[PDB]
Design a protein around this ligand. Sequence first.
Ligand SMILES: [C]O[C]1[C](OP([O])(=O)O[C][C]2O[C](N3[C]=NC4=C3N=C([N])[N]C4=O)[C]([O])[C]2[O])[C]([C]OP([O])(=O)OP([O])(=O)OP([O])(=O)O[C][C]2O[C](N3=[C]N([C])C4=C3N=C([N])[N]C4=O)[C]([O])[C]2[O])O[C]1N1[C]=NC2=C1N=[C]N=C2[N]
Ligand SMILES: Nc1ncnc2c1ncn2[C@@H]1O[C@H](CSCC[C@H](N)C(=O)O)[C@@H](O)[C@H]1O
Length: 259
Amino acid sequence: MTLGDLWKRRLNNCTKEEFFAYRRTGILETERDKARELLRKGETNMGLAVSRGTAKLAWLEERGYVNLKGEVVDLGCGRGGWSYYAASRPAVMGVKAYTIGGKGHEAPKMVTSLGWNLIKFRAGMDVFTMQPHRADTVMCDIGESSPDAAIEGERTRKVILLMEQWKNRNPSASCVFKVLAPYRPEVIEALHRFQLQWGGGLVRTPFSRNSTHEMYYSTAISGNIVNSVNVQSRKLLARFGDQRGPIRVPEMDLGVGTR
Ligand SMILES: [C]O[C]1[C](OP([O])(=O)O[C][C]2O[C](N3[C]=NC4=C3N=C([N])[N]C4=O)[C]([O])[C]2[O])[C]([C]OP([O])(=O)OP([O])(=O)OP([O])(=O)O[C][C]2O[C](N3=[C]N([C])C4=C3N=C([N])[N]C4=O)[C]([O])[C]2[O])O[C]1N1[C]=NC2=C1N=[C]N=C2[N]
Ligand SMILES: Nc1ncnc2c1ncn2[C@@H]1O[C@H](CSCC[C@H](N)C(=O)O)[C@@H](O)[C@H]1O
């Protein structure tokens, strides 16, 4: 058993009030009140982020932890926050975005956010059975939370296997992907094997809620994986009992128009 396993048990043991105070204490939160209503009313001419995912990828890029370029694939694009971020980047030439859609899942939001014309959205696509194709940058933000840590571990293992398949097709591609449950030993083993062949490392974005242990793997950073995970678990465990709220910041606005 790991510290993150204990974190997950302590999380599930929270009362409702305990859970909601813990969830958001100390985290960066974009201000989505304008964005939310524009999406709700169906405004397509907008550059405000279509989801909270945009600011997370923006943070990874601005830190230099990912370098989005060339032909980008977005595996599990959901509403498209990563696809629109990538399409607005001058070094990106095109985005192929894929998501399952269906009941309980987000379909792509269609807006004129800068570079939208460079995105080819395909909904109703399962990426886990899709044949990989050429890409310079491979992005994947898949990993659905579960109260069951073993399910979160297996969901995470499937994402890492997917990234191995896309690296097999594209050994030189940069990769960035969500690791939902890095605290699980089957996940650590798979991350080690990936890191040994492809390099890379783990990082926590300051926008992730304390109710998830998610971290992001990128081929462009480094770091011992176990220590990265353990630092994050201790930091998550140390926030239990904190009552401070979130730090609110402006939402990303990419502007509108074609590229
Ligand atoms: C009920 O549940 C709930 C839900 O879930 P889902 O997701 O829907 O899934 C379902 C599933 O799972 C499982 N389970 C459940 N339960 C149980 C189980 N298992 C066992 N073994 N046992 C038990 O008990 C099964 O398999 C089924 O089928 C959830 C909700 O969520 P949503 O809405 O979806 O959102 P998201 O995105 O996910 O986010 P969040 O919210 O933040 O979450 C994350 C995490 O956290 C936690 N939580 C949540 N919540 C809401 C809560 C919590 N915790 C606490 N303590 N409290 C509260 O309230 C978890 O871990 C998650 O993952 O959730 C759930 N829940 C509710 N409640 C509860 C829960 N869990 C645990 N515990 C509790 N108390
Ligand atoms: N097997 C699969 N094939 C395709 N899409 C999947 C999938 N499993 C999960 N997904 C989708 O992957 C998406 C992950 S959410 C990603 C958030 C996104 N990066 C943003 O910025 O908006 C979800 O919408 C989920 O429906």
